[PDB]
Curated annotation (Swiss-Prot), chain A:
Organism this protein belongs to: Picosynechococcus sp. (strain ATCC 27264 / PCC 7002 / PR-6) (Agmenellum quadruplicatum)
Similarity comment: Belongs to the phycobilisome linker protein family.
Membrane topology designation: Peripheral membrane protein
Record's protein name: Phycobilisome rod-core linker polypeptide CpcG
Annotated InterPro entries: PBS_linker_dom, PBS_linker_sf, Phycobilisome
Domain PBS-linker: from-to ranges: 10-187
Highest taxon in the source lineage: Bacteria
Principal location listed in the UniProt entry: membrane
Swiss-Prot/TrEMBL keywords: Antenna complex, Membrane, Photosynthesis, Phycobilisome, Thylakoid
Entry function: Rod-core linker protein required for attachment of phycocyanin to allophycocyanin in cores of phycobilisomes. Linker polypeptides determine the state of aggregation and the location of the disk-shaped phycobiliprotein units within the phycobilisome and modulate their spectroscopic properties in order to mediate a directed and optimal energy transfer.
GO biological processes: photosynthesis
Assembly and binders: The phycobilisome is a hemidiscoidal structure that is composed of two distinct substructures: a core complex and a number of rods radiating from the core.
Gene (name only): cpcG
Listed GO CC annotations: phycobilisome; plasma membrane-derived thylakoid membrane
PANTHER family linked to this entry: PHYCOBILISOME 32.1 KDA LINKER POLYPEPTIDE, PHYCOCYANIN-ASSOCIATED, ROD 2-RELATED
Swiss-Prot record, chains B, D, F, H, I:
Name the record gives this protein: C-phycocyanin subunit alpha
Subunit record text: Heterodimer of an alpha and a beta subunit, which further assembles into trimers and the trimers into hexamers.
InterPro entries: Globin-like_sf, Phycobilisome_asu/bsu, Phycobilisome_asu/bsu_sf, Phycocyanin_a
GO cellular component, one term: phycobilisome
Family assignment from sequence similarity: Belongs to the phycobiliprotein family.
From Swiss-Prot, chains C, E, G:
Gene name, Swiss-Prot/TrEMBL: cpcB
Protein name according to UniProt: C-phycocyanin subunit beta
Organism: Picosynechococcus sp. (strain ATCC 27264 / PCC 7002 / PR-6)
Keyword line: Antenna complex, Bile pigment, Chromophore, Electron transport, Membrane, Methylation, Photosynthesis, Phycobilisome, Thylakoid, Transport
Modified residues (N4-methylasparagine): N72
Function (record text): Light-harvesting photosynthetic bile pigment-protein from the phycobiliprotein complex (phycobilisome, PBS). Phycocyanin is the major phycobiliprotein in the PBS rod.
Length: 225, 162, 172, 162, 172, 162, 172, 162, 162
C-alpha cells in the first residue's frame, strides 16, 4: 500500500557520533544474556516497567511475559512488544492521547529518542489507525535504529540525553511526557480551585489597643499576684 | 474502561477493520444483560443505606479489635467509623456503576488498580472488605437473573481483594 | 549530577588553575562533616514511609477536596500515584543531601516537574505544603537523638531545610 | 543479589570498563562495615532462640484475636504457632544473612519480592511481622556500630513490609 | 554473578539453617584478606594494556601464521577484534578475582565462548597459550614487590593462577 | 562523572530503591581514601611547577626529533614548547582533580573521551604523554598510601593513552 | 533530498505538463557540466582532513578562548566533537555540490543545527568564520588546476561558494 | 525518489562516510545513459499528442464494451473519453519524467504506490493501461540507446500494473 | 564489501524491488572505470617491488629516530625493517585490490576497521604510513584516468589513517 511520507531528519544528540565514556549519566544497561540469576531478572523487569509504564503497579504487571522471560524463551524485545500491546499501555496511553501525541510518546519510549519533527509524528500516524496498534509496534521494532542501538537483548533507554561537563543534559522523558495532556484533563475537569484564600469571615475587625488601655496591663496582671 | 461496546470498538480499532456482524451480536446480547441490569441498579439504589449500615455492623462484629484497639486505621472513635461508612459506600457505589456499565471496567478502574499499595501502606486489611462484600452479597436479596450477575460481580470484587 | 568535590573540580577547571588553599580548608571541613552528612541522609530515609503517610494524612486533613470526589487525588490510582510522587520527592531530596549538593535535586526531578503538574491539572501549592511539612518531620527525625552520640548537625538541619525549600519552591 | 562487590562488577560490566580507583575503595569501606558485621552475625546467632520466642510472645500479646479466633491463618492451635515460629525464624535468619552479605540483596531476594501476594492471598497481615521485627530490634541489644547498621537494616525490613 | 559472601548465604539457605561458626572463621579471614584481594585486582588492571600487547606480541612471535595471510587474525579488524577478546578475558578474570569467586568468570564470559570460537573457526589453543602467558605476567605485576610492604600473597597469587587456568581450560 | 557517591546514587536510582548499609560503607570507605587524598592533592599543587618543567625536559630528552624537526606539531620553536607546557599542565591538573574527586570521572570526562581522534588528526604521538606521565609518577615522590593511588591513578592514565 | 534532475521533475509535476525545451537546454548543459561538478566534489574531499585541521588551527589562532579553559571547545572530547562537526559540515556541503542542489545541505544538516548550537551554548559566529575559511581553501583545491586540462569552472568555483555561504549563514 | 545520484548519497549517508571512488564512477555512467536520454525525452515530447490519440484508439478497439456499455468508469459518453485522454497523458508524461530523471523513482512515486487501490475501488481494469503502454512502446519508434532503455522502462510500467 | 554492483544489489534488496535502470547504467559506468582500472592494476603489479623499497627509503629518511632508537616498534635491527616491508607491501596490495574491485570495500574491510586500535596499542604512528602512501602516490607514473582514480584512492587511504 501507500508508503510513508519522507520527512527530513533534524539535528539531535543521537544521529551524531559522540565519544561516550563510562559514567553514571549513562543509563545502567539491562541485558537478558548476562542477568542469569533470579534477582537480576527482577531488576531488568523493573527497569523495563519503569520505561514503558512509569512504575507499573501490581495491577499493570503481566504475569505471562515475566514468567516466560524468566524461563528465557521470550526475548526482551518480544517482552517490550508484549508490554506495548498489553491493555494497560493501550488504556493508559493510546486511549487518552490522540494519535500524534501517542506516536510522540511511543517513539520516545521504544526508540529512546525524541521524534525529529512534527511531520514525522504526522507521517507515522497514518499507519496506526489504518493497520492497528500491533502493526505500528511491529513496524517500530523492525526499524534498524532500534536494532543498532539496543538489539534483541537490551532494554531501551534514553540515548545520549546528557553530554559531558553539563550539569543538566536533558529532561528524562519520563518527566517530560506523562499520559494525560491538557486536552484530556480538560475532559476530566481537574482544576477545581482549592479556594482557601480570602474567605471573608464576617466577624468584627480586631482593633489594636490604644496607648493607656486597661487591657495593655491585662497580660502582666494575669502573671502578677 | 471495560464495557462490551468499547471492547468491540477496540478490537475493530486495533485490527483496523470496519464494524462487523460479530461486533453487532454483543449489542443485542447486552439486551440479555441490561433488561435486568438497570432494574437491579435501581433496586440497589433503594437498598443502599441499610446495606452499608449492615455491612458496618458485620465488619465490627467479625473483628472486635477494630472497635477496641486505638489507632488511626482502626475505627475506635467516631471518625474512623465515618471513614468506614465512606469506604463501604464507595464499594457499593462502584458495584452499582459496574452493574450499570455492563462490565468490570468502572470497578476495575476506580478501585482495583491501587488497592494493593493502599492496603500495604495504610494498614487496611483486605479481609475487612471481604466481610463487607460478602455481607452485601448475602443481604442484597436480588431475584433471578439479576442476582446471578451480582455474584459473578461481587466475587470478582473479592477476587481482586484477595 | 554533581558532587561538591566535583563542584570544586569543575569550578577550578573553568578557572583553569589548581585548587586554592581556602577551598582546601573548606573541603577538609566538608570531609570532617560529611560523616554527619551521609548518615543524616540515611536516618532521614529510616522513617521515610511513615514520614510520607503522615505528611499525606495531614495534607488530606487540611484539604478535604483531594479525597472528595472530583478532586485531583480522589480515585484510587490517582491517590496511589500521589503517594508515589511524594515518596519520589523525598527520595530525591535524600539523594541531594547525600551528594551534598542540590544539583541532583534540580537536575533529576524538579525541572520538568513544574510543567508536568501544570499540564496534568495537578495543584502545585498542595505539593508545596506537603514537602514543607515533610521537611519539618525530616530534620526532627534526624535531629532527635535515639541511640546516637550527641553532635552538632546544625549544618545538616540547615542544609536539609534548604533542600526541602528548593523542592517546594520549584514545584510552585 | 546486592552486595557492594557484585554491584561494582555490574557497573564495570555495564560500562564495559575494568575497575577504576574508585572501585578499589569500595572493599576497604566494606572493612568499616565487616569488622563489626561478622561479630554482630555471631552474636545474633547466639541471641536467636530467645529472640524468636520473645517475638512470638510480643505478637501474641499485641493481637489476642490471633490466639483466640479459630482459623487457618490464625495461630489458634499448636500448628499455627509452629508456623509462626517458622515465619519469625525465617525473618531473623534473613536478617543474619543480610548482615553477613553486607547488602539487602539476600533479604530482598528471599523475602521481599513475593510478600505482597502472599500477604494478600493467604491473609497474613504484615503488621504482625512489623511487631515481630520491632521486638527484635528492641531486644537484640547490639553494641555500637553493629547495632546502628542493623537498625537501618531492620527499618528496611519494616519499610518493605509496610 | 555470585560474591563469596552470598556463596555462603546461598549454600546455607539450600541447607536451611544459620551460618555455622567454622564458616564464620573462614569469612572473617576472608574479610582480613579481602584487602589483598580487591586491590590485587586493581594492580592487575594497572598495566592491563601493556599486559595485553605483550601477550599478543609473544603469541604472534610464537605462531607466525596469525599475522600471515590466510591466518585467523590476519586482516586489520580481525586482529583488532582479537586484541578486544584478550582484553575482555583479562577484564573478566579481573572481575572474578574482585568478586573472589570464579562464578562471574564462568557465568559471564567463558560458557558460550567455547562454542563461539569453534563456530567462528577461531583456534582455541592459541587463546589458551595467550591467557596462560597473560596470567604469568598478571601475578608478577602482583607477585614482585617493589617499594611496598612484604606479605603472604602466596595464597592469593594462588587464586589468580586458578582463575587464569579456568579461563584457559574453558576456552580449549 | 565517576565518584563513589554518584555511582551509589545512580545504582539506587536505576534500581528504584532507597539507600542501604552500603552507602554508609561507601562513604566511610571514602574516608580510607580521602584522609590521605586531600593531603596528596595539596602536595601535588606545591610540586606542580617543577613537575611540568621536568616532564618537558624528559620528553625533549627522550625524543630529540621533536626539538629538531620543523613542524606544527613538533616543538621546534618557542610556541610549540608553550603548547607542550600547556598540555602537560593540563595532564597534571586532571591528575589533581582525579585525586580530589576520588574516582577517574573527572579525568575520564575531561581527557580520555576524545584523545584518540585528537592524536589521530593532529599528529600527537601518545608515547610523548606516556613519557610525561611516567616522569611525573617517578618524580612526585609521595610516600605510603599516596603512591599506590598514583600508580593506580597514573597507570590508568597511561592505559587510556596506550 | 533532491537532485536537480528531480528538481526539474517536481517543478514540472507541480506545473503538470511536460518539461519544456528551455529547461532541456539547461539540463543538457547541466549534463555537459556535471562532469566538472561530480569530480569537483571529490577533489574537494581529497584534502578534506587537512582542510579541516587548517581551518580549525586558524580558528583557534584567531579566537584563543576556545582552547583557553572555560571556553566552549576546551576539554578534549569537546574539541574532538568540534572537529567532528566541522568535518560533518564539510561532508554535507560536499554532498550538496554532488547532488548539484543545496536541498541536501538545508535538508540534512543545517536546519536544526541553528537551534542545537544555541541550546548547547555553542557560539555560532565562530562556526561561521570556520566554514567561510574552509570554503576559501575548498575552491582553491577544487578551483586550482593540477593534472587537469584547464577549462572553465565558473559554475563550480561559483556554486561551491554559494553552498559554503548558505552553510555559514544558516549556522549564524 | 530513485535517481542514481540520490541513491549514492543515501548509501553514503547510511554508511556515514564521505563519497567514495565508486560514487564518482556512477555519474560518468549516467553519461552513457543521459547522452541519449535527453534526446529521447525531447522526441517523446514531439511524439506525444499522436501517441495518446493512437493509444486511445487501441484501447477502444481492443475493448468495445467500454465504448458500448453505459457506466461511470466506462468511456461511453464524451467525459469518459476525456478522462481516458487524461489518464494516458499522465502515463506518457510519467514515462517522460522517468526518462529524464534516469531512474524509476518519479514513475514509482507518482503512479505505482496507489494504483492497486484505485484500480480496486474505482473499477479500472489495469489491462486497459497494459494495452495503452504496449501501443506506446510499439508506436514511439525510438532507436539505439533510447529504444533499449524505454523497453526496460515501459516493461517496468506493465510489470507494476500487472 | 563495497563494489558498485553489490551496493546496487543491497539497495534493491533493502527496497525489496527488482533491479532499476540506474543499476544497469551502474555497470556500463563501471566500464568508464574498469577499462583503465585493470591496466593500472597490472602496471602496479609490475611497479610493486621498487615501490615498496622506495617507500621504505622515504620512511627511513623522513624519520631517522626509527632506524636509530632501539625498540620493538622501531626498525632498529633487521627484523623491524622486515616488518616494515611487510606492512608497506600489505598497503600496496590493498591498493591494488581496491583498484581491481572498483570500490574501497576491500581496502576498507582489510585495513581500515582496526587500524586505530593497532596504532594505539602497538605504538605505530600513522604518519609513517602517511609518508609511505604519499611516496607511493608520487612515483607510480600512471597517466590519465588511472592516475586520477589513484589519487582519489590513495587520498582515501591517507584520510582513513589521519
Ligand atoms: C501459560 C502457562 C505457563 C505456565 C504453567 C508457566 C510456569 C512457570 N513456572 C515457573 C516457576 C515455578 N513453578 C513452581 C511450581 C510448583 N511448586 C511446587 O513445589 C510444585 C511442584 C509446583 C506447584 C504446582 C515453582 C516453585 C516455581 C518457581 C521456581 C523459580 O522461579 O525459581 C516459571 C519460571 C518463572 C518464575 O515464575 O519465576 C514459569 C515460566 N509459565 C507459563 O507461561
Ligand atoms: C472509591 C474507592 C476507594 C477505596 C477502596 C478507598 C480506600 C481508602 N480508605 C481510606 C481510609 C480508611 N478506611 C477505613 C475503614 C476501615 N478500616 C478499618 O479498620 C475498618 C475495618 C474499615 C471499615 C470497614 C478507616 C478507619 C480509614 C482511616 C485511615 C486514617 O484515618 O488514617 C483511605 C485514606 C483516605 C482518607 O484519609 O480519607 C483510602 C484511599 N478510598 C477510595 O476512594
Ligand atoms: C522524578 C520526578 C518525577 C515526578 C515528581 C513525577 C510526577 C508525576 N506525577 C504524576 C501524577 C499525579 N500527581 C498527583 C499529585 C498529587 N495529588 C494531589 O492531589 C496533590 C496536589 C499532589 C500530591 C502532592 C496525582 C493525583 C497524580 C495522578 C494524576 C493522574 O495520573 O491522572 C504523573 C503522571 C503519571 C501517573 O503517575 O499516572 C507523573 C509523571 N514523575 C517523575 O518522573
Ligand atoms: C523465607 C521467607 C518466608 C516468609 C516471609 C514466609 C511466609 C509464609 N507464611 C506462611 C504461613 C503461616 N505463617 C503464619 C504466622 C502467622 N500468622 C499469624 O496469624 C500470626 C500472627 C503469625 C505468627 C507470627 C501462620 C499461622 C501460617 C499458616 C497458614 C496456613 O496454615 O494455611 C506460608 C505458607 C506456607 C505453609 O503452608 O507452611 C508462607 C509462604 N515463608 C517463607 O518461607
Ligand atoms: C585502593 C587504594 C589502596 C591500596 C593500594 C592499599 C594498599 C595497601 N596494602 C596494604 C598492606 C599490604 N599489602 C600487601 C601486599 C603484598 N605484599 C607482598 O609481599 C605480596 C607480593 C603482595 C601481594 C601479592 C601486604 C603483604 C600488606 C601487609 C599489610 C596488610 O596485611 O594489609 C595496606 C595496609 C595499610 C597501609 O599500608 O597503610 C594498604 C594501605 N590501601 C588502599 O586504600
Ligand atoms: C552506614 C552504616 C553506618 C552508620 C549508620 C554510621 C553512623 C555513625 N554515626 C557516627 C557519629 C555521629 N553521628 C551523629 C549524628 C547525630 N547526632 C545528633 O545529635 C544529631 C541529631 C544526629 C544527626 C542529625 C553524631 C553527632 C555523631 C558524632 C560522631 C561523628 O561526628 O561522627 C559514627 C562515628 C563512629 C562510631 O559511631 O562508631 C558512626 C559509626 N557509621 C556507619 O558505618
Ligand atoms: C585538558 C586536556 C587536554 C589535552 C590532552 C589537549 C591536547 C591538545 N594539544 C594540542 C596541541 C599541542 N600539544 C603539543 C605538545 C606536544 N606535541 C609534541 O610534539 C610534544 C612532544 C608535546 C609536548 C609534550 C604541541 C606542540 C601542540 C601544537 C599543535 C599546533 O600548534 O598545531 C591541541 C590543539 C589545541 C591548540 O591549538 O592549542 C589539543 C586539543 N588539550 C586539552 O585541552
Ligand atoms: C548532521 C549535522 C549535525 C551537526 C552540525 C551536529 C552538531 C552537534 N554538535 C555538538 C557539540 C559541539 N559542537 C561544538 C562546536 C564548536 N566548538 C567551538 O568552540 C566552535 C564554536 C564550534 C566549532 C565550529 C563543541 C565544542 C561541541 C561539544 C559540546 C559538548 O558536547 O559538550 C552536538 C552534541 C553532541 C556531542 O558531539 O557531544 C551535536 C549533536 N550534529 C549533527 O547531527
Ligand atoms: C569517479 C572517478 C573518475 C574521475 C575522478 C574522473 C575524472 C575525469 N575528469 C575528466 C575530465 C575533465 N575534468 C576537468 C575538471 C576541471 N578542469 C579545470 O581546469 C577545473 C578547475 C576542473 C573543474 C573544477 C576538465 C576540465 C576535464 C576535461 C575533459 C572533460 O570535459 O571531461 C575525465 C575525462 C576522461 C579522462 O580524463 O580520462 C575524467 C576521467 N573520471 C572518473 O571516472
Ligand atoms: C498521474 C497518475 C494518475 C493515474 C494512473 C490516475 C488514474 C485515475 N483515473 C481516474 C478516472 C478515469 N480514468 C478513466 C479511463 C479509462 N477507464 C476506462 O474504462 C478506459 C478503458 C480508460 C481509458 C484509457 C475513466 C473513464 C475515468 C472516470 C471515472 C469516473 O468518472 O468516475 C481517477 C479518478 C479521478 C477523477 O475523477 O478524474 C484517477 C485517480 N490519475 C492520476 O492522476
Ligand atoms: C593487511 C593490513 C595490515 C596492517 C596495516 C598491519 C599492521 C601491523 N604492523 C605490525 C607490526 C610492525 N609494523 C612495523 C612497521 C613500521 N613501524 C615502524 O616503526 C616503521 C616506521 C614502520 C615501517 C614502515 C614494525 C617495525 C612492526 C613490529 C612490531 C613488533 O615487532 O612488535 C603488526 C603486528 C603483527 C606482527 O607482529 O607481525 C600489525 C597487525 N598488519 C596487517 O596485516
Amino acid at each position: 500500500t501507500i508508503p510513508l511520507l519522507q520527512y527530513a531528519p533534524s539535528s539531535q544528540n543521537t544521529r551524531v557520533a559522540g565519544y561516550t565514556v563510562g559514567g553514571d549519566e549513562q543509563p545502567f544497561v539491562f541485558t537478558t544474556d548476562n542477568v542469569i540469576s533470579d534477582s537480576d531478572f527482577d531488576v531488568l523487569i523493573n527497569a523495563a516497567y519503569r520505561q514503558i509504564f512509569f512504575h507499573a503497579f501490581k495491577c499493570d504487571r503481566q504475569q505471562l511475559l515475566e514468567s516466560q522471560l524468566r524461563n528465557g524463551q521470550i526475548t526482551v524485545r518480544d517482552f517490550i512488544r508484549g508490554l506495548l500491546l498489553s491493555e494497560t499501555f493501550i488504556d493508559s496511553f493510546y486511549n487518552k492521547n490522540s494519535n500524534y501525541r501517542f506516536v510522540e510518546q511511543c517513539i520516545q519510549r521504544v526508540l529512546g529518542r525524541d521524534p525529529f519533527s512534527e511531520q514525522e509524528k504526522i507521517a507515522w500516524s497514518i499507519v496506526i489507525c489504518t493497520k492497528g496498534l500491533a502493526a505500528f509496534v511491529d513496524q517500530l521494532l523492525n526499524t534498524d535504529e532500534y536494532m543498532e542501538n539496543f538489539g534483541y537483548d537490551t532494554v531501551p533507554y534514553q540515548r545520549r540525553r546528557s553530554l559531558a561537563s553539563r550539569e543538566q543534559g536533558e529532561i528524562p522523558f519520563n518527566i517530560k511526557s506523562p499520559r494525560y495532556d491538557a486536552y484530556y484533563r480538560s475532559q476530566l475537569g481537574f482544576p477545581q480551585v482549592v479556594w482557601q484564600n480570602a474567605v471573608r469571615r464576617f466577624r468584627t475587625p480586631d482593633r489594636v489597643p490604644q496607648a493607656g488601655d486597661p487591657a495593655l496591663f491585662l497580660n502582666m496582671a494575669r502573671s502578677a499576684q | 474502561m471495560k464495557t462490551p461496546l468499547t471492547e468491540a470498538v477496540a478490537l475493530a480499532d486495533s485490527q483496523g477493520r470496519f464494524l462487523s456482524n460479530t461486533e453487532l451480536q454483543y449489542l443485542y446480547g447486552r439486551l440479555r444483560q441490561g433488561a435486568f441490569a438497570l432494574e437491579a441498579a435501581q433496586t440497589l439504589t433503594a437498598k443502599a443505606d441499610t446495606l452499608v449500615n449492615g455491612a458496618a455492623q458485620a465488619v465490627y462484629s467479625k473483628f472486635p479489635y477494630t472497635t477496641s484497639t486505638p489507632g488511626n486505621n482502626f475505627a475506635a472513635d467516631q471518625r474512623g467509623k465515618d471513614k468506614c461508612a465512606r469506604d463501604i459506600g464507595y464499594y457499593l457505589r462502584m458495584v452499582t456503576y459496574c452493574l450499570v456499565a455492563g462490565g468490570t471496567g468502572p470497578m476495575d478502574e476506580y478501585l482495583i488498580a491501587g488497592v494493593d499499595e493502599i492496603n500495604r501502606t495504610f494498614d487496611l486489611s483486605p479481609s475487612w472488605y471481604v466481610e463487607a462484600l460478602k455481607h452485601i452479597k448475602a443481604n442484597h436479596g436480588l431475584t433471578g437473573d439479576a442476582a446471578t450477575e451480582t455474584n459473578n460481580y461481587i466475587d470478582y470484587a473479592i477476587n481482586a481483594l484477595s | 549530577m554533581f558532587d561538591i568535590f566535583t563542584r570544586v573540580v569543575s569550578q577550578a577547571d573553568a578557572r583553569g588553575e589548581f585548587i586554592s588553599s581556602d577551598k582546601l580548608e573548606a573541603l577538609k571541613k566538608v570531609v570532617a562533616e560529611g560523616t554527619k552528612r551521609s548518615d543524616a541522609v540515611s536516618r532521614m530515609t529510616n522513617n521515610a514511609s511513615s514520614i510520607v503517610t503522615n505528611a499525606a494524612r495531614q495534607l488530606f486533613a487540611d484539604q478535604p477536596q483531594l479525597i472528595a470526589p472530583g478532586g485531583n487525588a480522589y480515585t484510587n490510582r490517582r491517590m496511589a500515584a500521589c503517594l508515589r510522587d511524594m515518596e519520589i520527592i523525598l527520595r530525591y531530596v535524600t539523594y541531594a543531601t547525600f551528594t551534598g549538593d542540590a544539583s541532583v535535586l534540580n537536575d533529576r526531578c524538579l525541572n520538568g516537574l513544574r510543567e508536568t503538574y501544570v499540564a496534568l491539572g495537578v495543584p502545585g501549592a498542595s505539593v508545596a505544603a506537603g514537602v514543607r511539612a515533610m521537611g519539618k518531620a525530616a530534620v526532627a527525625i534526624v535531629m532527635d537523638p535515639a541511640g546516637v552520640t550527641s553532635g552538632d548537625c546544625s549544618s545538616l538541619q540547615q542544609e536539609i531545610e534548604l533542600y526541602f525549600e528548593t523542592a517546594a519552591k520549584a514545584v510552585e
